[PDB]
């Protein structure tokens, strides 16, 4: 029962939804993607101006 | 773990593409800014400003 | 004897704790610093914009 308990606690990590991916690594991927999208928007604006 | 590894490798491959695209835009604008005539004209501007100053 | 012979496959839970700790820490160490370096290059591009 203890084995089941900390296995569930380790896999859930405080979220009701399962967390297969590393959560802070996942939001790191998300912020990298968002900042890359902002840089791409600036770059495409510069491409349109050029 | 393999999923996240492939994701980060894709990000590493892709970021350099737009970095080098930024480099292409800068280098191409620099190339089109000064033609063959303009480089020698600006060198003569350097000579003229030096001779005056 | 079933409780001594029907153990689930793989190393047990108390060992699986440091197993998953090691695997997740190497997964994070292989990738997070790369993400930070990528973000440094990306913000260098941002200030070159």
UniProtKB/Swiss-Prot annotation, chain A:
It is found in: Cytoplasm, Cytoskeleton, Microtubule organizing center, Centrosome; Cytoplasm, Cytoskeleton, Spindle. Contributes to mitotic spindle assembly, maintenance of centrosome integrity and completion of cytokinesis as part of the HAUS augmin-like complex. Belongs to the HAUS3 family. Component of the HAUS augmin-like complex. The complex interacts with the gamma-tubulin ring complex and this interaction is required for spindle assembly. Interacts with EML3 (phosphorylated at 'Thr-881'). This is HAUS augmin-like complex subunit 3. It comes from Homo sapiens. The gene is HAUS3. The chain holds residues 504 to 553 of 603 of the full protein.
Swiss-Prot record, chain B:
Transmembrane segments: none annotated. It is found in: Cytoplasm, Cytoskeleton, Microtubule organizing center, Centrosome; Cytoplasm, Cytoskeleton, Spindle. Contributes to mitotic spindle assembly, maintenance of centrosome integrity and completion of cytokinesis as part of the HAUS augmin-like complex. Belongs to the HAUS4 family. Component of the HAUS augmin-like complex. The complex interacts with the gamma-tubulin ring complex and this interaction is required for spindle assembly. Interacts with EML3 (phosphorylated at 'Thr-881'). This is HAUS augmin-like complex subunit 4. It comes from Homo sapiens (Human). The lineage of its organism: Eukaryota, Metazoa, Chordata, Craniata, Vertebrata.
From Swiss-Prot, chain C:
Residues 15-49 form a coiled coil. It is found in: Cytoplasm, Cytoskeleton, Microtubule organizing center, Centrosome; Cytoplasm, Cytoskeleton, Spindle. Disulfide bonds: none annotated. Component of the HAUS augmin-like complex. The complex interacts with the gamma-tubulin ring complex and this interaction is required for spindle assembly. Interacts with EML3 (phosphorylated at 'Thr-881'). Belongs to the HAUS5 family. Contributes to mitotic spindle assembly, maintenance of centrosome integrity and completion of cytokinesis as part of the HAUS augmin-like complex. This is HAUS augmin-like complex subunit 5. It comes from Homo sapiens (Human). The lineage of its organism: Eukaryota, Metazoa, Chordata, Craniata, Vertebrata. The gene is HAUS5.
